[PDB]
């Protein structure tokens, strides 16, 4: 509605509430605040244009404003059509960020807006899911040589970009921010663990304790989702295709079965595979009446909605972010958040302190691209662990935690080999 | 605004959304559904008038509709001015329940509406905090003849009523529903454990893991809040006045210290004491910058607001359900939900399956009073344990769980003494 | 072998090692040490004779020596033929305690020794399982009028004594020490939780994580056994006959099924029912090859050994405290500790700090019997909660823990009823 | 005492008990049983000579017998002077393994026996701490021609060997078995987590719940020790030098502080660093009376014994595997197992099912060296991940667990980039 050359938002009059959300979470983001103070002093992004595809809530907004405080000209598009928070996006538009996003936008608008964000002709692309980096290579090839590099937030995006590199069509360097220690060990595990159940509880008002919770995938996200589900009193069943991770889940005290056996007994199903069709026709047919299904992975393809639609004689919407599929025999199965990221659609995403660290790495990755892209090949890179170390020490210090320091004798001992029994 | 003899609600046009909310949670309340079918078949409350003071959200609405389906004429008032959900109440007014409640009620409206609810001339009073039963004894003594009895939902109300009995001011029988095994072992512990953190995450979007969570009170609510806080990754510090429960918290793996020591290190404070001034002036003075405070117990007197106001040079409202008290030294302390029941004010209360068992007991208590008021004395009773077992057996059956049966030989062994060795 | 009028022990030359065990655990028993200092000063048991039936390890020995330091003449017999520690018992004999116990003694010696302990003509009987109190009523009735009272340590004994009271044959007062808050909330739960797995690991050297652990009974012992099993990485399945406790186990995150379904899937079975024949023929027939079975309840009747013997074509003993039952189809099932208390036969029983509190109550119960038995009927009593409070405050102080104290305003508030919304 | 050219053991007559111990744990080692049948059928080590330095208990004996069943001639020496179990070693001598070990070995005997084990002129060396591989490089350089390669079991040894490679002193290939997923994710974490507390309870009979447990090091062992300590009811304090791992411990719910601060409040201290002097003079000076200290890492240098001896006015031995250092102010600090591997010295090491997977990898590593030594360089290698997957699949199958299979469509999706949205 409020839609022009510089932005396309639902309603600019929502900006005051968006500003309050941005100010609130920024009070609990000490690492990005530390970085923002440096950016304001040195203005390292003066004259630099940045286009970002991220989940457009208040922590994302604070990162974009941090990049702007460093001198950058920033455009932004949504990483998911349903995760955008309209009031936050109005505040971004008021701040001069060229943001193009409306909550609930269509898939075609999702890409029409992504193109508009790309119109800034970015030097740096910040991506979440690799849609924007892929879109440039497919439909905006005229702009490739102007792009220094990109940084990718999530596992699904890194998988896509590595396949792009394998096929020889990646045309600029990419930082796999997801692969940094202070990202996947914290965001993917602890962040997703809390916010997935935050969203499921918010959407349903249902009890987690005494439920059979089925977690499909025992990677970093599945681990955290299973961890916190157990912490909320649930009986957790893990479904995995990796035999090593399946044994880990056993040692962690969780049941391990395949997806058909899990489908018969699960009360709540959560997918975190980054894969396609992990739950489909024959699993829905086995599910108990009232089964809750949620996706915490990527896009909307982990739980195969077309199979649910073919089984349903009625499709209803009893609550916001709850789609009811009524089957022939009268069973009703419930899909949360239209099969999209339940933590970001049914809730407010990861907590502020988690995205502080993930978006601190993103800020450092943008600086790394700015300053090293000419020595980098069109390949996927991981940030040096020194940046991980810096983010961790800033967080610990803001926490008031002082850790042991190695003595010179101990450093010597760890490099030696003669001191045995 | 939509106010009359039979109801007083904010907006009747919100009823359609309220109905969707009631329909939803009712799908996950099997025990109360079992009872509603019995009530609908037999109509045990035909001609009976029931006045209820409860937290007016969707699970409460299904309890009130279940009583109406049993033939009762039902009036309803809010148990807390900020827990009422206006769309649910609109649906109750449309359903013929004489409900008088608006979210954000003044204290004067709170008691005016409770008086309007009493105008039904009830035979049975269902109470939640003992305000209504106290109000009849103070201001509506002409109602005492017609009143068969009352039922009290919560710990705080039962304490008040037992005190009224001790002083000899109680005039009609009272069922202490809170004292049923199927209530305080589940509602108070598991329900409050989940819904307290549901509300805290919803209000703040902050990380629970790696925080110092201080839980004041290690009763049934405190146990649950502490258990789920640990499940979400927090370090938990328990503050108690009972030495036995303090040792229980230690053995459960939690730190135990006094309120002053806890105030210095806590990041999030949760009170669940049912007592007054468990966090007060001297504790606020010790708290770290950015401390989060929330009350999970009765009323709003556990965290003493007047002390916060006197310390504050500025009182701000950065988020819905977050009050910011800025102190002279620049520190900011955040009180959630105005110091009232954080699960019911900042979220949707206990999950549906928990309220199913609690309100099943309430429905049984109302039927118990109906069937026994001529045999009861003006004192506090607890439901026979056979009702607890019925509720637990209906729930287990609806879960598809069948448990081991105690054999006749085993029963006789348990009543013998000669078989030792 | 070293067997006379004053004692019957395996070998007095083992006393030096027994003294060291007694000294060791006594360093970590601050509550009983506190009581012992009082006893040494006041000598309240001067001229009093005490006969005890307890598990004769080093914590029991310290209680008996504490009673002796108070002036008592003490005799002792084993509460279980397999839990006696011969070196501890030699030290007791060297100390002047009239102890009659040899590890591995027969059932007939178990009672022959119990009679010898009774020959002291006790004023006070301290019992664990009610064998001695029952033996007096059956076979030593000539001595009843000389006995002031008894105290019973465990749930199984209290069950027997209450049945004795019901039948009208209990002839002196009995203190149900097991029923004290500081007993069953700590000994039965936390003590049994740790020491059961202490014994199972010691006997087997097998992994607990990633195992299906079946806990039969979800009372105080079963809760703790399930708690700690989960803490060691196991998948815990709870078998219960109480529907309320079955739901508790669900809410605590454990599977709940009946014993036939549990038998098919369990890797380790632990009984804590205090009942007879909870695991029998048809369950053994369903068990997987290599199933481990252990009893943590009472006697050796919870797992029905006669059924295992009838199924076995070979009975072997591959490890100390491991009996192998080789079945017709080649399956091998393993019973720990001959079906007796696995924590006390395969290990060293509860940890010292736990039995500090249980045996502190026992010392206070003996004092309570001494001083109140003439005002007591031949019935089962529970100690006043003031003693529970005293034990808890001594433990907290020895721990360096200072708890909140109620203000006079708060005490007033909890007795009031007028202060509502 | 029973010493000769082919073996040196304490007492050959202990062999019968050693065999029972080997037979027992072998029943619960399915993966190594699977490999032993393959080895027995194919005899891949016919004519091969293998010298091993391992902790000589029953699971090690089954590994050595499995290699012998494959046709290998096997010599064995102790990996630690106090972890050897004399009856197991007696059985190995009876079985034809050239084992030279006695529990309680002097340091001189330790290296004399390791030299006797090397007299076999091995083709493959299996090492556990890199003492033997270091000893060949220092004192048996004439052996270097015939040596195909070595395999290192543990973190400390791999560090030594990688340092030897860096300095260019390594002369033959080395397999870093510790670096296999199926090893360090399970042995180091879950195995050490259980067996450390197994040993601590066995030595002390003290309560774990409600204690302040300080874990020094949050690597794989530290993670496991902390996780199981929390599972047993303790409050866990983590001391780290890695800032990333320190934040992991916080998010896992543990307190994080430096060694001096932890020394003031810890009740039980466990070191798992693989480093020297992580607890030393200044820390002992701060410790509470009665502090328990134990080492779960390499050698006995993590807790610096010489500092304890200098502080002590008295050194006593109140229990087996408990050394008491009485300080000038009367405080008593207790070091378990002489500061050596507490799980292996005060207990029976890792449980059998854990060592099954670790020693399956060792058997595969020995076969790998046999099959690849002519293609390898004098540097440190890690086994191909296909062997990890084989071990995990054999274990899952023996558990009756069948996991979901990755479909061809899903594999192709994971190698694509065009499918976004
Ligand atoms: N806020 C969020 O919701 C959030 C945060 C981080 C990452 N993610 C997304 O979550 C997904 C995974 O995150 P990760 O970092 O855990 O990936 P990961 O690869 O660590 O874990 C993936 C696991 O999925 C398992 N898997 C794949 N197909 C499967 C199937 N059909 N059935 C069962 N298990 C299967 C794999 O074996 C692997 O262990 C990605 O899509 C990532 O983008 C979401
Ligand atoms: N939905 C909800 O939020 C919900 C649900 C159930 C109960 N409640 C309310 O929660 C409160 C307690 O519920 P309960 O069932 O736990 O009561 P409970 O009495 O079991 O626990 C109360 C604990 O508070 C401790 N306590 C009292 N004053 C204290 C102080 N000054 N400092 C520290 N500890 C103190 C007492 O020792 C007691 O153990 C009541 O007000 C009850 O109505 C709220
Ligand atoms: N050191 C120890 O091993 C130790 C310590 C304390 C008590 N105990 C013994 O443990 C036993 C129980 O201790 P408690 O204090 O837990 O008793 P408790 O009564 O609290 O729990 C007993 C549970 O067993 C359940 N039960 C009974 N028969 C059953 C069956 N056939 N199948 C399944 N569940 C069944 C009951 O429902 C009850 O919940 C008693 O024999 C007591 O003496 C042993
Ligand atoms: N059966 C056993 O007891 C067993 C089993 C496996 C490994 N280990 C031994 O345990 C040790 C570690 O095993 P790992 O696999 O955990 O190593 P790891 O390196 O994963 O963990 C080591 C941790 O120690 C930390 N550290 C180093 N010096 C420190 C100090 N001074 N203070 C605090 N933290 C410090 C490092 O930061 C690192 O995180 C090695 O010696 C290994 O051989 C023992
Ligand atoms: N954009 C795609 C891919 C999944 S996004 C997953 C990413 O979201 C990120 N994330 C989680 N919570 C938040 C938040 O509150 N703000 C911004 N990003 C978030 C997190 O870093 C993770 O890598 C989609 O919606 O399906
Ligand atoms: N008088 C005080 C305290 C009583 S409320 C505490 C009660 O609220 C109940 N409760 C918790 N969640 C819900 C809900 O969603 N609907 C209705 N009652 C609830 C719970 O049973 C508990 O006993 C006040 O009203 O604010
Ligand atoms: N004597 C019977 C009944 C069970 S005894 C169970 C009791 O043992 C007690 N107990 C547990 N550990 C110890 C210990 O180390 N010493 C003495 N008593 C113990 C505990 O208090 C519990 O009530 C039998 O052996 O079957
Ligand atoms: N060189 C040092 C540290 C190496 S031992 C650490 C290794 O012991 C192994 N281990 C643990 N329990 C057992 C057991 O019962 N038998 C054999 N090895 C074991 C485990 O795999 C780990 O990598 C020393 O020998 O004392």
């Amino acid at each position: 509605m409020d839609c022009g050359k510089d932005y396309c938002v639902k309603d600019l009059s929502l900006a005051e509430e968006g500003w309050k959300k941005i100010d609130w979470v920024s009070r609990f983001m000490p690492v990005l605040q530390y970085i923002k103070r440096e950016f304001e002093e040195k203005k390292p992004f003066k004259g630099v244009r940045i286009a970002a595809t991220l989940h457009l809530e208040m922590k994302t907004a604070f990162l974009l404003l941090t990049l702007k405080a460093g001198g950058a000209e920033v455009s932004a598009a949504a990483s998911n059509p349903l995760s955008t928070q309209d009031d936050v996006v109005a505040a971004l538009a008021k701040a001069g960020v060229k943001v193009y996003a409306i909550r609930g936008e269509s898939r075609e608008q999702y890409y029409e807006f992504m193109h508009k964000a790309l119109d800034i002709r970015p030097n740096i692309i910040i991506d979440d899911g690799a849609d924007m980096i892929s879109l440039v290579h497919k439909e905006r090839q005229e702009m490739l040589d102007e792009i220094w590099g990109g940084s990718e937030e999530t596992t699904t995006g890194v998988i896509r970009l590595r396949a792009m590199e394998k096929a020889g069509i990646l045309k600029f360097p990419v930082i796999a921010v997801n692969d940094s220690y202070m990202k996947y060990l914290f965001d993917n595990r602890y962040g997703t663990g809390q916010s997935t159940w935050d969203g499921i509880m918010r959407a349903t008002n249902l009890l987690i304790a005494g439920k059979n919770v089925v977690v499909v995938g025992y990677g970093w996200c599945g681990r955290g989702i299973a961890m916190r589900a157990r912490g909320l009193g649930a009986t957790v069943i893990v479904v995995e295709v990796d035999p090593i991770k399946a044994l880990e889940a056993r040692m962690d005290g969780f049941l391990v079965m395949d997806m058909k056996e899990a489908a018969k007994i699960g009360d709540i199903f959560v997918t975190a595979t980054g894969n396609i069709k992990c739950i489909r026709r024959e699993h829905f047919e086995l599910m108990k009446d009232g089964a809750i299904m949620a996706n915490a992975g990527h896009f909307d393809v982990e739980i195969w909605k077309p199979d649910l639609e073919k089984l349903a004689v009625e499709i209803n919407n009893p609550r916001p972010n709850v789609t009811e599929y009524k089957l022939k025999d009268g069973r009703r199965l419930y899909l949360l958040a239209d099969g999209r990221l339940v933590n970001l659609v049914a809730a407010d995403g990861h907590p502020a302190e988690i995205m502080d660290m993930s978006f601190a790495l993103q800020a450092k990755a943008a600086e790394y691209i700015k300053d090293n892209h000419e020595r980098l090949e069109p390949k996927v890179y991981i940030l040096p662990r020194e940046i991980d170390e810096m983010v961790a020490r800033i967080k610990l210090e803001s926490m008031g935690i002082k850790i042991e320091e190695l003595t010179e004798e101990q450093k010597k001992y760890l490099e030696s080999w003669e001191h045995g029994t």
Side-chain angles (χ1 to χ4, degrees), chain A:
Chain A
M1 308 213 273
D2 287 316
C3 195
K5 274 138 156 45
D6 286 347
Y7 49 74
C8 196
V9 315
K10 165 135 270 175
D11 176 12
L12 287 163
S13 80
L14 300 169
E16 181 184 281
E17 191 44 58
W19 280 118
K20 292 170 69 90
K21 282 160 156 192
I22 289 159
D23 182 69
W24 170 250
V25 298
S26 84
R27 302 177 192 192
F28 303 89
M29 293 174 89
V31 180
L32 207 42
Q33 291 277 24
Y34 183 96
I35 287 169
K36 175 172 186 275
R37 188 243 283 103
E38 293 194 62
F39 282 5
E40 283 158 352
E41 165 184 308
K42 292 147 141 180
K43 299 304 231 88
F45 292 116
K46 190 127 298 193
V48 183
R49 301 179 304 284
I50 294 173
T53 291
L54 299 162
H55 295 285
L56 284 172
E57 51 69 63
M58 53 282 204
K59 281 97 65 198
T60 287
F62 187 55
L63 163 67
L64 304 181
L65 295 170
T66 296
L67 293 174
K68 195 166 203 280
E73 202 203 329
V74 185
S75 70
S79 200
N80 181 291
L82 295 186
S83 70
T84 298
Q85 295 196 5
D86 284 330
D87 53 8
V88 174
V89 156
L92 282 172
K94 285 316 238 155
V97 171
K98 285 170 181 54
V99 56
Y100 307 84
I102 300 183
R103 196 179 178 102
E105 64 196 31
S106 74
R107 165 182 201 281
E108 292 314 319
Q109 302 174 297
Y110 173 90
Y111 282 118
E112 168 214 346
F113 287 162
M114 198 167 288
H115 274 297
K116 272 164 176 170
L118 281 173
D119 286 348
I120 211 175
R121 318 200 64 80
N123 303 113
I124 303 163
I125 287 182
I126 300 178
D127 211 343
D128 187 348
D131 278 339
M132 175 165 276
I133 291 172
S134 160
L135 183 59
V136 171
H137 284 84
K138 279 180 201 169
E139 290 171 40
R140 307 290 292 267
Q141 321 85 320
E142 94 271 358
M143 153 187 312
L144 279 180
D145 60 62
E146 189 151 23
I147 293 168
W148 303 343
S151 66
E152 173 53 45
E153 174 82 1
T154 204
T155 317
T156 277
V158 177
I159 291 331
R160 289 175 74 184
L161 298 169
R162 291 195 189 282
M164 273 172 60
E165 180 183 337
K166 264 198 123 183
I169 71 107
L170 175 64
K171 252 66 172 87
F172 54 69
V174 153
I175 309 306
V177 177
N178 184 74
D179 291 7
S180 286
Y181 284 134
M182 296 295 317
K183 207 285 181 171
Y184 69 87
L185 292 170
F186 291 85
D187 175 304
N188 297 39
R189 173 168 53 181
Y190 302 118
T192 312
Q194 170 172 313
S195 66
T196 291
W197 296 109
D198 189 0
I200 286 175
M201 294 196 276
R202 205 177 299 195
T204 70
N205 193 219
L206 299 185
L207 174 66
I208 305 308
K211 297 290 184 57
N212 286 346
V213 167
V214 173
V215 185
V216 191
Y218 206 66
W220 296 112
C221 289
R223 271 159 216 258
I225 292 163
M227 201 191 316
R228 292 319 177 205
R230 203 233 303 262
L232 294 165
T235 291
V236 180
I237 302 108
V238 173
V239 178
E240 249 294 344
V241 305
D242 183 333
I244 294 169
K245 297 183 182 168
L247 274 179
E248 283 191 283
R250 278 312 271 141
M251 287 333 153
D252 289 330
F254 304 130
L255 297 179
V256 173
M257 58 200 67
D258 84 346
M259 178 85 250
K260 282 185 215 75
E261 288 301 312
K264 297 164 212 249
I265 60 161
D267 296 312
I268 301 171
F269 296 85
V270 183
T271 52
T273 67
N275 210 352
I276 187 178
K277 295 169 176 165
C278 310
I279 309 195
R280 49 198 305 191
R281 172 174 71 252
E282 62 273 13
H283 310 119
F284 305 132
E285 304 187 319
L286 294 174
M287 281 181 189
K288 301 198 300 233
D289 179 33
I292 301 297
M293 296 169 293
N295 174 35
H298 73 318
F299 302 145
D300 60 332
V301 297
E302 311 210 5
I303 305 165
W304 200 239
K305 289 187 274 180
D307 284 353
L308 272 160
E309 297 158 350
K310 279 181 205 28
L311 285 170
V313 289
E314 278 188 35
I315 302 171
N316 306 300
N317 291 276
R319 308 284 315 117
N321 303 314
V322 177
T323 309
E324 160 189 322
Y325 297 93
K326 193 188 259 164
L327 315 190
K328 218 87 100 193
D329 63 15
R331 277 182 299 135
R332 281 175 297 186
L333 311 181
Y334 303 111
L335 183 62
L336 296 197
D338 199 31
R340 305 187 184 272
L341 299 197
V342 67
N343 63 323
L344 275 149
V345 178
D348 290 303
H350 288 182
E353 295 93 335
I354 288 294
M355 304 290 327
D356 185 36
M357 304 187 281
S358 299
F359 281 164
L361 293 176
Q362 277 286 3
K364 292 323 272 201
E367 226 185 325
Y368 191 92
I369 286 163
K370 172 177 115 273
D371 291 344
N372 294 295
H373 68 269
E374 300 293 352
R375 275 145 254 130
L376 290 182
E377 281 179 86
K379 307 192 154 207
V380 180
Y381 298 88
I382 296 170
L383 292 170
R385 298 329 181 161
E386 295 42 65
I387 295 142
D388 290 278
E389 207 254 19
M390 190 198 333
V391 169
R393 284 170 173 290
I394 296 169
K395 178 55 170 174
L396 284 169
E397 169 170 326
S398 79
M399 278 184 116
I401 297 169
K402 183 166 163 73
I403 68 182
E404 259 325 273
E405 303 170 19
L406 284 166
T407 77
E408 276 318 287
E409 186 181 18
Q410 288 174 327
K411 197 230 164 153
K412 260 278 289 293
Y413 180 84
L414 293 168
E415 325 196 275
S416 61
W417 60 264
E418 293 197 290
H419 307 119
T421 280

